[PDB]
Every structure is written in C-alpha cells, then in structure tokens.
Structure 1
Amino acid sequence: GSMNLLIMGLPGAGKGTQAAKIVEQFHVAHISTGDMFRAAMANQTEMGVLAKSYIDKGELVPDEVTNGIVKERLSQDDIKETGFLLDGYPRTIEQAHALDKTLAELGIELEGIINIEVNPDSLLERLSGRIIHRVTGETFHPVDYKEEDYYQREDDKPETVKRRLDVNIAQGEPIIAHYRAKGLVHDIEGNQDINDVFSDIEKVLTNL
C-alpha cells in the first residue's frame, strides 16, 4: 500500500521497461519528466500553462517553473493513494535539493531508489551498434559483409554515445551519492534478462 520511489539508470539500461513492470505489480504512479510536463500542459494547470508560454516560444523552462510543476504533480490525489515512481527527475544535484525541499514541504518521505547499474562499456556497445545500408535501408548491429556499404545515424555513432554516457554519468554521480549517504539507494544489476532484473527489483521493493 503506497510507496514513494525514484528510478535511475543510464541510457540503455532498460529503465522504461522496468518502470512499467513496477507499476503493474505495485500500482505506484509512474512519473517521467515528459509525463509531468505533458500532464500539466494538456490538463492546463496553472504551472502547465505557464510552462507552455516558454515551450511554445522555443525557450527553456526556468528552474522555478519546473519546481512548481513537480510540486503540483506530487500534490495530486494519486500520489497520496498509490505513491509514485519518479523517472528522469531529479536530473542534477540542484534539482535533487529542490525535490527534497518540495517533499519536506508536502510532508512526504522518499522510501527508496531503484538504481539500475550496467557497465558503461556494455552500454556503449549496445547503443552504438546500429548500422544502416545505403539504398536498402536495412538495419544491422550481424552481416556487414561490406564496411563501406553502411552508415550510422549521428545519434548512434560511438563518439556520440560515449559523450552521452559520460555526461549522464557525471550528472548522475552526485545525485546517487547524495541519496546513498542516506541509505535510500538500491543497486540492481541490469545485465540480466528483463524478468530477472525485475525479480531483484521485486525483492527490494517488497522488503522496504
């Protein structure tokens, strides 16, 4: 009955799939950054219509507005009833500090953090393998009988993925340390089958 959770993991770690499995078993509200903003705007909340005025103009959403969005979301009814699984926020240590303030104001306590760990070299190989034929557009990872008959999306080039992973690691490290120092972080080995990863998650959550 109700749990207040964060889920964390580097790109390619399968955070999305696990979140959906967590919802199915434990009924917490899965809340990604995208969901939160889409809700605020589509449901036309006070913060949402405010956020929309920046987004429509192609401008960045200020921290003050983002923090209001979050507080608004965690203020909803479903949060009291079912708890939550916050996904993608906080993204920086500053947002972690802002979140803690909001949770304290709301009288809410974080109960656990699911941290899916996968070796960044394994992630790199998994995210930067996709290769595409020039005229048939056939996708690979596997074949390649001709090195020059293929190309990669910019998003999928090893240097691009490597930078993405490095930035995500650097931004996430102080957040993980911040909450680990409070015993809230539970490391899950992510290099398993989907059902085995979730199996370890299930053990953690039922024993909270």
Structure 2
Amino acid sequence: SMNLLIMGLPGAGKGTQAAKIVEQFHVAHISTGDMFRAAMANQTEMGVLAKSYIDKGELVPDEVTNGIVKERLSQDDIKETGFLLDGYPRTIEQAHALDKTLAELGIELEGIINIEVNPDSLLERLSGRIIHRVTGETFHKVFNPPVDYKEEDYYQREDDKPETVKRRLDVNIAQGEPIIAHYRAKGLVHDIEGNQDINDVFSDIEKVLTNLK
C-alpha cells in the first residue's frame, strides 16, 4: 500500500501512467471524475449536492468538492490498498483542504508523481487534432498526419484550437504551480521526465515508487 498523488499538465500522459501504476502497484486510482461519479452513484450527502449544481451547468463549490474527497478517502479500500489521487487538488486551497482531510483520517501522503513536459511542446501536441472537411476522418498534426497534408483540407473542434488550448494550459500552470511548490517544500514531489516513450516514463516512475519505502 502507498498513498500517492499524480500531477501533470493536460497531455502529459497522466492517464496512461496512472493505469500502469495501478496494474503494477494495485493502488486505487481516483480521478476527480471518479470521485464525483461515485458520490452521485452512491447518493451520498455531497453527491446529491454536486448533482444539483451539475444538473444546472454550474461549477461545484469547494465545500462540496472537498467533502466528496473526504467521503472517498473514508472508504474501506483506502487504508487497504492505498491510492493515486489524480486531478484533485486543483488549487492550493484544495490542497490545504486535502491536507486537513488526510490529517483528520490519520493518513500520511507518501509521494507525488509529477510528470513534467514543456508547456510550449504540449501546446503543439494538444492543438494537433484535425478533421477532414469532406465527410470522414480524424487525424493529428503530430501523431498521425494525413496523406500529403495541407491545412485547408481540415478543420478543428473548438477545444482543439491553439487559442483554446493555450487558455487551458495557462489555467493549469497558474493553479498547479503553487500546489507543486507546497508539496515540494516537504520533499514529496518526484519530477518525472514526461519527455520519453510510455515505457521509459514508467520505468522512471517505478524507480521512484519501489524506492519510497
């Protein structure tokens, strides 16, 4: 059992590495989407409140979000298998709330996998998805270019356009950096070079996690 966070900007490979971490180390991967879904499925105190905001298209308040996390971390699997929290905390306020939650449950955080990738590089990756303008097909400027390729043959979904991606990276950099610093001051942050093949990133994670205890 290990008690862990994973962090990283959008596109950094967190989802893939999280799944590899579970397969090998058998901790419970818990994303913000997972915790919300479980709260609503279980009809918990906070889950029915979250549903009430989500049904109206409204962002959920931190008292509810932090309460969902406290519900999640109180489950039996947590002290049995440990966990890999992904997505939460979103902000330094949520990190301060998590730390109170953990202390009250008598759980110690043991490590943070921080996958780093240059955000200018991430902008190019995340803004690569293109759709052929004559009815058929998805490609990607970096990962899967179409035959020949000329830009006028494609369009993009709004969330894949460079300006939209830049906004998303800017918020995650602004919100994430104070959290990474907060935990780095306590030696909990292990920086992983996201600049590698899937198995090479995972190898570096395995050197971190198998050495922790």
**What band does the TM-score fall into relative to the shorter chain?**
over 0.9
Residue deviations 1:136-175, cap 9 Å, x none?
3323334454432221211111121122111111110000
Residue deviations 1:99-123, cap 9 Å, x none?
0011111111100000001111211
1:46–1:157 distance in 2 versus 1, CA, 3 Å: same
Identity of aligned residues (%): 100
Shift in Å at residue 183 of structure 1? 0.3
1:202–1:72 distance in 2 versus 1, CA, 3 Å: same
Task: Please say which of residues 158-167 and 55-64 is displaced more in the overlay.
Answer: 55-64
Q: Distance in 2 between matches of 1:132 and 1:139?
A: 5
Give the SS at the match of 1:204: helix
Residues 99-118 of structure 1: matches in 2 within 5 Å? Answer: 99-118=98-117
1:57–1:157 distance in 2 versus 1, CA, 3 Å: closer
Task: Please say which of residues 61-70 and 171-180 is displaced more in the overlay.
Answer: 61-70
Task: Please say which of residues 100-109 and 140-149 is displaced more in the overlay.
Answer: 140-149
Task: Please say which of residues 46-55 and 2-11 is displaced more in the overlay.
Answer: 46-55
1:145–1:176 distance in 2 versus 1, CA, 3 Å: closer
Look up the match of 2:93.
Answer: 94
Give the SS at the match of 2:114: strand
Q: Distance in 2 between matches of 1:101 and 1:35?
A: 21
Unaligned 5+ segments in structure 2 are 141-145
TM-score by length of 2: 0.92
Task: Please say which of residues 58-67 and 110-119 is displaced more in the overlay.
Answer: 58-67
1:26–1:41 distance in 2 versus 1, CA, 3 Å: same
Unaligned 5+ segments in structure 1 are none
1:51–1:146 distance in 2 versus 1, CA, 3 Å: closer
Look up the match of 1:32.
Answer: 31
Residue deviations 1:71-93, cap 9 Å, x none?
11100100010111000000000
Q: Distance in 2 between matches of 1:85 and 1:108?
A: 13
1:140–1:51 distance in 2 versus 1, CA, 3 Å: closer
Residue deviations 1:28-82, cap 9 Å, x none?
0110001001111112222222322332233332211111111111001000101
Task: Please say which of residues 176-185 and 44-53 is displaced more in the overlay.
Answer: 44-53
Look up the match of 1:82.
Answer: 81
Look up the match of 1:67.
Answer: 66
Shift in Å at residue 22 of structure 1? 0.4
Give the SS at the match of 2:51: helix
Alignment RMSD (CA, Å): 1.4
TM-score by length of 1: 0.94
Q: Distance in 1 between matches of 2:153 and 2:210?
A: 51
